[PDB]
Amino acid sequence: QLHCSYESFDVESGVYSVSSFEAKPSGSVVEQAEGVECDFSPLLSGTPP
Amino acid sequence: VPGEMRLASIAFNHPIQVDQLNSSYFKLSIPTNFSFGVTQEYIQTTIQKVTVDCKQYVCNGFQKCEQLLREYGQFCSKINQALHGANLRQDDSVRNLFASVKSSQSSPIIPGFGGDFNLTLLEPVARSAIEDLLFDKVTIADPGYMQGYDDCMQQGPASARDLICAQYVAGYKVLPPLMDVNMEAAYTSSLLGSIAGVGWTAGLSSFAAIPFAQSIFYRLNGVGITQQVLSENQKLIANKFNQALGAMQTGFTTTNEAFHKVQDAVNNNAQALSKLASELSNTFGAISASIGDIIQRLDPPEQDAQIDRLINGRLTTLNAFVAQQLVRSESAALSAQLAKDKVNECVKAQSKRSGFCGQGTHIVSFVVNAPNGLYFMHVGYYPSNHIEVVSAYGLCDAANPTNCIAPVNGYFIKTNNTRIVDEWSYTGSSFYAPEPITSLNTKYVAPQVTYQNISTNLPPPLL
Amino acid sequence: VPGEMRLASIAFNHPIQVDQLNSSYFKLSIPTNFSFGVTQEYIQTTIQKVTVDCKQYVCNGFQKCEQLLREYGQFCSKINQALHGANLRQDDSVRNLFASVKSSQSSPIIPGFGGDFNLTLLEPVARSAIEDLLFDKVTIADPGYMQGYDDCMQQGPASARDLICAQYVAGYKVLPPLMDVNMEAAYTSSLLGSIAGVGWTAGLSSFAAIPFAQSIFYRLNGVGITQQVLSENQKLIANKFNQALGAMQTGFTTTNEAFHKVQDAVNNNAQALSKLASELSNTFGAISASIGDIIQRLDPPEQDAQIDRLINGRLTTLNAFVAQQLVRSESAALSAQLAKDKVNECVKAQSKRSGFCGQGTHIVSFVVNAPNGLYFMHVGYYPSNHIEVVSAYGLCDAANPTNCIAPVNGYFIKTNEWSYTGSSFYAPEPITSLNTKYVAPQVTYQNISTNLPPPLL
Amino acid sequence: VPGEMRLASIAFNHPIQVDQLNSSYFKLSIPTNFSFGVTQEYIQTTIQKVTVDCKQYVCNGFQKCEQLLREYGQFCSKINQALHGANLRQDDSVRNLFASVKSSQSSPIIPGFGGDFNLTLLEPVARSAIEDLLFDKVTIADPGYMQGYDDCMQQGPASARDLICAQYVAGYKVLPPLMDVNMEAAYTSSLLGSIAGVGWTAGLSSFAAIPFAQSIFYRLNGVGITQQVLSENQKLIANKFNQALGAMQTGFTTTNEAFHKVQDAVNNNAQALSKLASELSNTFGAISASIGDIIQRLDPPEQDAQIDRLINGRLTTLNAFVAQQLVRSESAALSAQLAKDKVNECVKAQSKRSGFCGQGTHIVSFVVNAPNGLYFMHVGYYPSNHIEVVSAYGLCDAANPTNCIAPVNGYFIKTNNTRIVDEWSYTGSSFYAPEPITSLNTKYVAPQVTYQNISTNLPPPLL
Incomplete structure (x- = not known):
């Protein structure tokens, strides 16, 4: 990556920063809930407006 | 309850008037008392060194920016190179400074140094109590490096609010100071070991290695105070000096402009770092500041219209940031050069130039470590x-x-x-101290019409 | 009419050549005449301080801007804070200047001060004759504060075009200088009164209180001119010096570069304000540069879109402007420090450094007030x-x-066969113990077989 | 092949310790050997002066461009004026430098100047061997003006690859330097010829015209070296002096920091050009980087939308470019001021201030012409x-x-x-060298209790 950043096959000696580690992510947990099955029954009969 | 503010004229203090006189004689103003006192200054010498991950600052590993930023990779390289060069420049100024700080030789330093002078500046063998008070008076966030990952992480107090832990979110990196604080303490003690002293001609080869008080007398004779008076008043001199020294414990207040500047130098670094952090939440008209959030709620053909807008503003922020740091780096280099000159002049030698150093003629001055810089103290004569x-x-x-x-x-x-008994008398120029005229304090000169015509007793020459 | 232009070569002013010589003796180049002369420089010490209303700059209080700018109000806070700090720094530098300018003591000054020297620089007991000429030559717009605003309003000339009163449309505020001009003049008069002592050790506390001519002869001895010459030429010296002094009335010309630089400093401030004023009319592709026009010409959804476009360009000019002022402020601060450095060296005492001051060794120098800065003059010796x-x-x-x-x-x-002359001038004299010192022997010293009075033997 | 890198502590070179004695006498540190040594520095005084055609940078005379830039004509004028004023400023600084560089008089210089000193620095009567070595080490492209126009063209080598000829496409213009290099070389030779007088109570009024080595002995007494030693060791001094001089041929490599800085000044000018050149190909999301290509591909209602987008980004690069050049010009002017002050201190005369010049007291120093600036060298006592x-x-x-x-x-x-035979001996402060006590080495002073009590033979004066 350093060679590509300087577009060369001989980067000058030094200490150089390079991109950081992504820190090892793991599987999900949730606090989602609670409720009751939504009732859409007003749509099931009569004439719409 | 307090009343109204009062309009007032700005005072115009006036100089003491002294009449000019014609003919062969004139009035001469001369002080009849004096006091020791001090002044101080802070000169910043460096900019904190930082780098920024140019991928994570914009996008935290999302797969769209893994392709979308590829066409912008050359901007990042320009950003990294400029910052990297700025960091190298800061470390060059450090090495160049220390090359002049060091001496070929110095005295060992022991307790009871300075004789009757208190010299509370001496390290608690250490840095110094004065330096430590400065670091404790400063309101700066708890130090970096160790414990690193574990001071961001839950292995610590819940009350930490350090931007240093936020550097592990944002991908920011703070580089360590080059000099090593222990070596810094050694350099300031090396400077103290060259004290006593600056006199005995140029002083650029030989080292006098004499007691502190004696060097003070040479500085006092360097400003025209006669030695006869100085020998009479030696305890007085130590006492007045120590009173001026004692005032430095009240010097850690906001009315000390140098002290205030140290805090502001710290504040400016904190502000620059926090400015980038505040921009992380700044949408550019994008639906959300989080890339993962907009990915989660958008169809990919329009998803990256939003991502592109977000990318453009974030890159623009980085460009502005680099420019700001480059300017600061140059000003610090120049500021460091001034301090370097003062170390090799105001500290390493007495000077007659005035202007420089404290405003009280010039007598010995000292320098101590300060955050990102040097803090000078100047003893003076009022x-x-x-x-x-x-x-x-x-x-x-x-x-x-x-x-x-x-x-x-x-x-x-x-x-x-x-x-x-003599009609005329010799005095020191810095203080009123009449004495007999002798060959030691006079020199032969060409005649002039304004010289007095003395018809009787002159011992220098007797004839 | 004129003919064709003339191609030419740049002249090279060749130095006078002096041959090095073999053995125990050598050529010495030494002047047989001299003249006084004057040089000058301008050192700026400040940037004019301004602030701007961050609402008025963008709109005239039209309600849509009042709503829309709430999203951008934090930018205005940063704008105001940055400018305010810059203004404080300019006034910090002024206090620091005066800390070096003031003297603990000075001579009273009267007309006819300086004796045989004319000294037209003396205050008209006031500013100085030189400053009076300077301020008349300066092309700066008429000052505000008082009568101020009532010279901006319709009861005044219809022809005013000054940025000084256009600021009450634009919302700019030109801040007053930290110091009253009369106090400033008094400080430079105190510097004239700080002459004598100049020499006689560092002079730091003592005050000799002697005639100006007398202090000059001391300084001339200090640069290697012998006293014998000085006593013979006293009136000649006064005349040549006053010729150099008289040339100052012609110093307010376009060939004086320091003078030109003062005018440029005046115009740098004018340019900064005029740039913002021109941007008030700068349509950014918006339907009009005026908020009221786009409100009256557009459906309210479109009014909001066009007002935002207009606001964005207006804020951008403000941001660039602040950055520009930060750069200028710092350069002035450095320049102000340089003025202090010359005041504590070039002005308060004679110096042997060279480089500094006028290019003719160093003899007494003077300083006067100038817009946003100090104007120095130096007497040179040629x-x-x-x-x-x-x-x-x-x-x-x-x-x-x-x-x-x-x-x-x-x-x-x-x-x-041998004679003594001062290092500054050709003028032979007998060798006497006052003009010589004992030294260790050297192979190149002359072997004198005849008569030397110092030592007699 | 090599193994792993080695971790190391940074060494602290400690100063020679000297014991702090009490009582009426003390240890004195004094050197017993020395060497000449040198230091070098590069101070830039100028940056390249440029102008840019504000129509050509945008397009190659295309008509859509010609009409569409009319609304932006005032930007071009501001661009031209800002750069033009910066160019005038660069020329002002050069004239100011030369005003202080020139001398009213100088010595003629012939081969064999400097006596036993080699003086290979002298011009090959010319510029100088040092300047030519420097110019060969510098990698900068050759300037035009006499002419190289046909080397842009088919009437010259097909292998030319100069960015210098590419300015004809960009509308970029390289301005000629303010002064003829031969006249510049004449000024540097006059500086060599300005030695002697070196002082002698100013020396502004006079020209002593004495041998170079003779003026050196005057300088050596100026740093506390006794003349007795100097007369004995004159050939040795010349030998050490020439060894120090011969080492200058190795100052043309990157371990010399001043040398590296010269190359970096060249690089910075090259960078400014390369950025403008690369931007000519930089589409801003416009359908093509070429105006003629946009014209041949599009219906005029869209054709000028693409062109306007392209123009705005091109103007933006010009604005950034000017701002960058304005900053550099100011820093160069300040850098030039530093150099002229060193010419009137480090070069024109011996100085006692320290800090400045080489780090070994100060003895004679030299300066040569360098690209964009002056290159100094200093010599001193180690x-x-x-x-x-x-x-x-x-x-x-x-x-x-x-x-x-x-x-x-x-x-x-x-x-x-x-x-x-004398119980006490006198020495120079720069070197250990005892001598009999005589009146020439001492002065009468006020009495003090710490002065030694000699009750018998004391010759300066004996009575």
Whole structure:
């Protein structure tokens, strides 16, 4: 990556920063809930407006 | 309850007036008392060194920016190179400074140094109590490096609010100072070991290695105070000096402008870092500041319209940031050069230039470590209780017009002291101290019409 | 009419050549005449301080802007804070200047001060005759504060075009200077009164209180001119000096570059304000530069879109402007420090450094007030009519080789057998103990077999 | 092949310790050997002056461009004016430098100048061998103006790859330098010829015209070296001096930091050009980077939308470019001021201020022409092999206590030399070299209790 950043096959000696580690992510947990099955029954009969 | 503010004129303090006089004699203002005192200054020498991950700052590993930023990778390289060069420049100034700080030789330093002078500046063998008070008075966030990952992480207090842990979210990196604080303490003690002293000609080869008090007397004779008085008042000198020294414990207040500047230098670094952090939440009209959030709610053909807008503003922020740091880096280098000059002048030697150093003539000055810089202290001499006295341009033999004298580094004044039978007397130029005129304090000069025609007793020359 | 232009080569002013010589003696180039002369410089110490209303700059209080700008209000806070700090720094520098300017003591000053010298620089007991000429030459717009605003309003000339009263449309505020101009003048008068002592040690507490002419002769001895010459030429010196002094009335010309720089500093401030004023009319592709026009011409959804476009360009000009002012402020601060450095050296005492001050060694220098800064003048000393003479490294007694001498502040020259002259000027004199010192012997010292009075033997 | 890197502590080079003695006498550190040595610095004084055609940068005379830039004509004028004023400023600084560089008089210079010193720095009568070595080491592209126009064209080599000829496409213009290099070389030779006078109570009014080595001995007495030693060792001094001089041919490699800085100044000018060149190909999301290509591909209602987008980004690069050049020009002007002050201090005369010049006291220094600036070198005294000796603050002839003396520019040391019968000996402060006590090396002073009590033979004066 350093060679590509300087577009060369001989980067000058030094200490150089390079991109950081992504820190090892793991599987999900949730606090989602609670409720009751939504009732859409007003749509099931009569004439719409 | 307090009342109204009061309109007031700005005072115009006036100089003491002294009448100009014609003919062969003139009034001379001279102080009859003086006091020790100090001044201080802070000169920043460096900018904190930082780098920024140019991928994570914009996008935290999302797969769209893994492709979308590829066409912008050359902007990042320009950003990294500029910052990297700025960091190298800061470390060059450090090495260049220390090359002049070091001495070929120094005295070992022991307790009881300075004799009757207190010298509380001495390290608690250490840095110094004065330096440590400065670091404790500063409101700066808890130090970086260790414990690193574990001071961001839950292995610590819940009350930490350090931007340093936020550097592990944002991908920011703070580089360590080059010099090593322990070596820094050694450099300041090395400077203290060259004290006593600056006199005995250039001093650029040989080292006098003499007691501190003795070097002070040479500095006092360097400003025209006669040694006879100094030998009489030696305890007084130590006491007044220590009073000026004692005032430095009240110097850690906001009315000390140098102290205030140290805090502001710290504040400016914190502000620059926090400015980038605040921009992380700044949408550019994008639906959300989080890339993962907009990915989660958008169809990919329009998803990256939003991502592109977000990318453009984030890159623009980085460009502005680099420019700001480059300017600061250059000003710090220049500021460091000034400090370097003062170390090799104001500290390494007494100077007659005035202007420089504290405003009290110039007598010995000292320097200590400060955050991102150096803090200087200047001992000085303040005249008081000025009186006017009669004085002459010179004295000469009335029996032989080619025989003449004039005072060396002092003045010929009419005698007002009951111990001196002679009509004229010699005084030091920095202080009122009449004394007999002797060959030691005078030199032969070409004759002039304004020199007094002395028809009787002159011991220098007797003839 | 004129003919065709003339191609030419740039002249190279070749230095006078002086040959190095073999053995114990050498050529010495020394002047046989001199003249006083004057040089000048302008050191700026401040940037004019301004602030701007961050709402008025963008809109005239139209309600849509009042709503829309709430999203951008934090930018205005940063704008105001940055400018405010810049303004404080400019006034910090002023306090720091005066800390070095004031003296603990000074002579009273009266008309006719300076004796035989004319001293037209003396205050008209006031500013100074030189400053009066300067301020008349300056092309700056008429001042505000009082009568101020009532010279901006319709009861005033219809022809005013000054940025000074256009600021009440634009919302700019020009801040007053930290110091009253009369106090400033008094400080420079105190500097004139700080002359004598100049020399006689560092002078730091003592105050000699002696005539100006007397202080000059001391300084001329301090640069190697012998006293014998000085007593013979006293009126000549006064005349040449007053010729150099008289030339100051012609210093307010376009060939004086320091003068030109003062005018440019005045116009740098004018340019900064005028740039913002022109941007008030700068349509950014918006339907109009005016908020009221786009409100009256557009459906309210479109009003919001066009007002936002207009606001964005307006904020952008403000941001760039602040950055520009930060750069300027810092350069002035550095320049102000340089003025202080010359005041504590070039003005308060004679200096041997060279480089600094006018390019003619260093003799007394002066400083006066200028817009946003200080204007310095220096009296220079210029050598002329150089001749070459034979000179020797030193002299010894041929019969007593350990008795060796060397000249003090001058040279031993062949007598057109040996004679002493001051380092500053050609003027031979007998060698006497006052003008020489004992030195260790050297192989190049002359072997004198005849007569040396210092030592007699 | 190599193994792993080695971790290391950073060394702290400790100063030679000297014990802090009490009482009337003290240890004195003094060197017993020395070497000449040199330092170098590069101070840039100018940046390249440029102008840019504000129509050509946008397009190659295309008509849509010609009409569409009319609304932006005032930007172009501001661009031209800002750059033009910066160019005038660069030329002002050069003239100011030369005003202080020129001397009213100088010595003629012939081969064999400097006596036994080699002086290979002298022009090959010319510029100088040093300047030509520098110019060969510098990698900068050749300037035009006489002419190289046909080397852009088919009437020159097909292998030319100069960015210097590419300016004809960009509308970029390289301005000629303000002064003829031969006239510049004449100024540097006049600086060599400005040696002697070197002082002698100013020397602004005179020209001593003495041998170069003779002026050096005057300078060596100016740093506390006794003349007795100097007369004995003159050939040795010339040998050490020439060894220091011969080392200058190795100052043309990157371990010389000043040398590296010269190349970086060249690089910075090259960077400014390369950025403009790369931007000519930079589409801003416009359908093509070429105006003619946009024209041949599009219906005019869209054709000018693409062109306008392209124009706006091109104007934006010009704005950024000008701002960058304005900043550099100011820094160059300040850098030039630093150089002229060193010409009137580090070069024109010996100086005692320290800090400045080489780090070894100060003796004669030289300056040569360099690209974009001046290259300085300095020479100085580097003491070594310090020893401690017994020394006294002064001597007071105790059989008659009113006779008190102290050394001038040197010290009184206990005698360790078999040739000298005197109990005390005088030495120069720059080097260890005892001598018999005589009136030339001392001055009468006020009495002090720490001055040694000599009750018998004290010769300066004997009475």
